[PDB]
Ligand SMILES: CCCCCCCC/C=C/CCCCCCCCOC(=O)[C@H](O)CO
């Protein structure tokens with residue numbers, strides 16, 4: 055469960071960082 059949480063959160067960070075760069 056914690057792995058899943060951390061992974062979702064890391065991925066959302068990635069998505070939001072990429073969108074900000076674009
Ligand atoms: C029997 C099969 C059952 C399947 C199990 C249920 C699966 C439910 C699926 C959920 C997928 C939703 C993912 C969230 C996408 C949002 C991207 C977030 O993007 C962003 O961060 C914004 O674009 C920022 O502006």
Ligand SMILES: CCCCCCCC/C=C\CCCCCCCCOC(=O)[C@H](O)CO
Nearest residue numbers: 055056057058059060061062063066067070
């Ligand atoms: C700025 C926007 C930030 C958005 C933050 C999103 C955080 C991610 C949200 C939830 C992570 C929960 C993981 C779910 C696994 C199931 C837990 C339950 O698992 C279990 O073990 C059962 O209870 C017992 O079988």
